[PDB]
Design a protein around this ligand. Structure first.
Ligand code: HEM
Ligand SMILES: Oc1ccc(CNc2cc(Br)cc3[nH]ncc23)cc1
Length: 371
């Protein structure tokens, strides 16, 4: 798993993110780094408009394009939504929208902030010798003070990385099916359920680092896009780049490649039927880095793992296979508890279509067991 830009340690996350940009972009890095102060004080829009269009030409390597995609993405969010209480800007100054779309088209990602930006690429190690633990990590950017962007993004990333552990087992699954190595296929499928089970226990920290009021009345604002959004019914103007406004979807863990790849590996068909849930998870593949996108389409090239287990009358496999599927139902069920706390309950102090979506995606996962 190498032309797919999958890291063995952190999987789909970008390993070792650049923290700083070339000096040529210090007028970008200064806004990005002070979005909370700059919003609260009423200047961010100003300070953005008073900017010189910069060239991306001095963004050499990928990690530099990736930091800049993040820097510009966070700034865009800050510009459009501003203070997060309804004063929306619907035109993105050419001095920012042009070099953003330039980089976005270069990296075949939409010009909006995505999961691969504010999670897969929005982190640093405090001490490079300590492991990947919460106490040794931080985020590079945030929107407001108290938006719990650090907790949300790092727990998200830490759960990714947990599930990542399973990705290195996918080759052995497919090889054990080809070579008809029954003992091995079984072990590999239990190893994968075990990784998905640790991913859940990690998710448990969310409560210690996120605040419901903050997630719902603040962070969720800055993460919202402009697709089917009343406040931007027609999209955003990317001044100096598109002639018409363009709708793009806010960030969402449906943009995450790990969970899609296990729904695919296990033959769970979140992307079938043309239902609302399937279409959405399919669309979000277009917000994933291109290599992570071909990773998914390449698994689908493979012999179904599900059909292979069905077809063997081998209780021990049907268990190993169900151990995997169950872990996704565990996670999806624990996710709904958190959605109840961090959205539904604050919302009452809209939120029904979310639950239909999450509950359909679960229902499709549970209805894939063999029990
Ligand atoms: C406060 C914490 C969290 C909240 C409030 C939250 C809320 C939501 C909501 C409302 C959705 C609806 C889909 C969308 O709008 O994009 C969603 C999707 C999703 N969330 Fe979260 N989420 C949180 C943390 C996490 C974490 C830590 C994970 C896993 C690491 C996760 C995994 C997902 C996934 C995979 C989806 C896509 C649907 C699915 O496959 O289950 N979320 N989340
Ligand atoms: O209006 C909104 C906008 C965004 C959201 C949630 N979006 C997310 C962003 C990131 Br990054 C990671 C995530 N995990 N689970 C959800 C999720 C909910 C209501």
């Amino acid at each position: 798993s190498k032309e797919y830009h999958i890291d063995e340690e952190v999987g789909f996350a970008l390993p070792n993110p650049q923290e700083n940009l070339p000096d040529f972009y210090n007028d970008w890095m200064f806004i990005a780094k002070h979005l909370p102060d700059l919003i609260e004080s009423g200047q961010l829009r100003e300070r953005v408009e008073k900017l010189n269009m910069l060239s991306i030409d001095h963004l050499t390597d990928h990690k530099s394009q990736r930091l800049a995609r993040l820097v510009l993405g966070c700034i865009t969010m800050a510009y459009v939504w501003g203070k997060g209480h309804g004063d929306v800007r619907k035109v993105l100054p050419r001095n920012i929208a042009v070099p953003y779309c330039q980089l976005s088209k270069k990296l075949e990602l939409p010009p909006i902030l995505v999961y691969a930006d504010c999670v897969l690429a929005n982190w640093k190690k405090k001490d490079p010798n300590k492991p990947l633990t919460y106490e040794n990590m931080d985020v590079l950017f945030s929107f407001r003070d108290g938006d719990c962007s650090k907790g949300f993004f790092l727990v998200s990333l830490l759960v990714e990385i947990a599930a990542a552990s399973a990705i290195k087992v996918i080759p052995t699954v497919f090889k054990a099916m080809q070579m008809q190595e029954r003992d091995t296929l079984l072990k590999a499928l239990l190893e994968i359920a075990s990784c998905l089970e640790k991913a859940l226990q990690v998710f448990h920290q969310i409560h210690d680092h996120v605040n419901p009021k903050a997630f719902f009345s603040v962070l969720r604002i800055y993460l919202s896009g402009w697709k089917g959004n009343p406040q931007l019914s027609d999209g955003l103007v990317y001044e100096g780049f598109w002639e018409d406004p363009k709708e793009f979807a806010g960030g969402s863990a449906g943009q995450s490649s790990v969970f899609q790849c296990f729904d695919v590996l296990l033959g769970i068909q979140q992307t079938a039927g043309g239902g609302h849930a399937a279409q959405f998870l399919q669309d979000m593949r277009r917000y994933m880095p291109p290599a992570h996108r071909n990773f998914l389409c390449s698994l689908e090239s493979n012999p179904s793992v599900r059909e292979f287990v069905l077809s063997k009358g081998d209780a021990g496999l049907r268990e190993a296979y169900d151990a995997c599927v169950k872990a996704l139902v565990s996670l999806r069920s624990y996710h709904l508890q958190i959605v109840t706390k961090y959205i539904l309950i604050p919302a009452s102090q809209g939120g029904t279509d979310l639950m239909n979506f999450l509950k359909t995606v679960r229902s499709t996962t549970e209805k894939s067991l063999l029990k």
